[PDB]
Amino acid sequence: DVAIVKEGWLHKRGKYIKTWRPRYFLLKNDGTFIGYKERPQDEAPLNNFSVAQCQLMKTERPRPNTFIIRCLQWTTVIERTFHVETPEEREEWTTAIQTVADGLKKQEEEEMDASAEHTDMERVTMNEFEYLKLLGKGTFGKVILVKEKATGRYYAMKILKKEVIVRVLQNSRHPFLTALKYSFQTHDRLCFVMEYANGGELFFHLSRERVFSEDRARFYGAEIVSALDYLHSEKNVVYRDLKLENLMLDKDGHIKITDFGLCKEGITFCGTPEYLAPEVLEDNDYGRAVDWWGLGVVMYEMMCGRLPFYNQDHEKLFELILMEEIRFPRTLGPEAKSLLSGLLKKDPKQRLGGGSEDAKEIMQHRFFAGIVWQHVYEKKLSPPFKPQ
Template identity: 55%
Template sequence: GEHIKNWRKRYFILRDDGSLIGFKVQPEPGQYADPLNNFTVKDCQVMRQDRPRAFTFIIRGLQWAQVIERMFCVDTHDEREKWVAAIEYVDRNLRQDIEMAEEASTLEQQNLRDKFNLSTRKNSSSKITLDNFEFLKVLGKGTFGKVVLCREKASAHLYAIKVLKKQVVIAKDEVAHTLTENRVLQTISHPFIIALKYSFQDAHRLFFVIEYVNGGELFFHLSRERVFGEEKTRFYGAEILLALEYLHAQGIIYRDLKLENLLLDREGHIKIADFGLCKEDIIYGRTTRTFCGTPEYLAPEVLDDTDYGRAVDWWGLGVVMYEMVCGRLPFYNRDHDVLFELILADEVRFPPGLGPDACNLLTGLLTKEPSKRLGGSERDAQDIKEHAFFCRIHWDQLLTRQLTPPFIPQVTSDTDTRYFDQEFTGESVELTPPDYHGTEGPTFGLNSISEEVEQPYFQQFSYHGTTSLVGSAGSAVAAVETPLTTEAPAKGERCMVDEHDPSSGSE
């Protein structure tokens, strides 16, 4: 039949149940109830072609008893390849029978899901408890509790569980920060930010079930190498920049950027962790006043006890990039009063041999006045991305993890914990109940703490993974959920694209 000449912009989301749903603009996270288009990729055939436009692909499949072809177009070859690979991956999974799916390599499945950042949709009403997990190794310990490597029994996927003692959280006035971290992690999704799978509680503790990455902290690797060099610093700095850009677009400032909160995954990409100090509802022009952070990384405006905004994160980026490329902090003194004076008044100095672009970038990021700081304008991250230091970065490829990291962690398996402190990994994974004074009581098995007793502080704490878990690309919810141009099909075909939608416009 005669083809419709106009193309309509649509924002499509591919689910791993095979549904391909389209919206006029990017929907809010979780607001997927009323799509303009609702297709399926189950039992489909995907064909590439470069007509009538470049980077076109066609999805051919059955609707009712009729073969339907739907034509899509994206902006680049890489985008098309990403979409085709993701669609074929989902279709292949749907074709497998239950037995084959159970026998499939869980590692391969997780790696593919991470690679394509597929949005998942769960409809689980069952209660998550410790009984759902097998605890394997202690990864770390702190004031509030510990982090334990675990395996989810139902899926065999590995996760890290952060275990916080309620009494300590309450006693140290960390309830608000803990709830903020839980709330924020439920709503964000980015390839360079650690992902939350579940959160739940029992009588004594709070549990965050988060994405497990075993490449180690940047702090660990920099301590070994002393200095990263400009190329490695450029790569890590760019990935951190994209994560902060995404957070700022969501109205969130991070406020706790430091090497200890920057992890590497198995492939060598950045994952930002620990969202306890982040602040919501901070867009350009809005400010907050809370004094918080790590002393060596505090921005001058925080120390001045004045209102501050999202430019604090660009100061933090400047500090961690300075550490990477120079091998030391830009300002340091053991006496915090002296340290704070240095941050407020001292000029940043650079070692000989550091390139002019690196010096210029760090000078811009470490500018005392936030309004004059690189990234401090309404353009936010865009000003930093356009700096000469980053001129060789292909931002789209970086965001979709297509660029090879400068260092690949030398891990032999998913349970290889060589980059974690051996002081912790050799400890028992058993949990101990806190007594009324906040100290540890007699040891007993994990499964004996299974009853969830909610306290007034934590009534809304539990989260069972009902929204997208992983990654995003640019302003998209997930890497495969990018704006996609679609051509309406031939007249007379049964399709949910509205051929006469007057508000859809044409290109």
């Protein structure tokens, strides 16, 4: 059992629309801090909501009595901002959150301290890398393409301000996710060195080819489903960032989902607007099903050569996403249409993959009939396109 430690109403800062919305938050002793559109009445917790290893800031801008939960999630620093009516309310909340997180560090350290099996033993610096290209900036860091001097190999390096936080063994065993190769700290930075595939950007391949056949999109979609299934069920994590720009190919033509993002909240949104799920736009409560929406948008784009929702005005784009039904090119087949309609259900509870079975729902869809999912995971499907 997981018990509620503190609960109540808070104003949640919005990223895309309303800016400040009232939500009913539960802080639980497993570390989850989750907001709901109304007092829930009653799925497995997602680590995205954990307050474990957070740092807590009080602040008076842009609103008196606001507090921030800042957390490092894998290689990305995220910040969750809230506001209450009184400075007293805020002290109750920050105190409860701290107490929960403290109790998690304590029980964990005690457990590892007890289970250490002559792992009581006691690799790199900035200088070993050549800068080549800025890949992106965020509020607390930057991502750059680097060449490792000693080997000639290319990596993406994520460089974070160390002070806002204060792993390579924790790497996921999945072929199509971005593996962390090194992690190191300087005097003022924490840097993550991660793989960089050299088969090109799928965004660029799709642009040049105009559209992918249903069979080519089925191959890429299967590799993506396999990776998201792993994240969801082995890591208890949602990706939240699936867009075409975040798909690359390796030299053999297999997919790599990239981990190059940084939050931009605090010095143009974070998520690319055309890929955002309705419940993310509305800061409604969200779960594993947000990734299946992203899969829908990306496979719509591969098989149709254009987005399912677009407008240069992002408020009209948001309204398309929330309100308009999808139309399909006249040449798309019914298995593809069935998959895409299912993935792009606006209600996460009705969306394909949104039930307790998660990715299994999608793996069983008739669009994927004949895919051997064990072969997908082992890179035994032969790629329809080999990059140069």
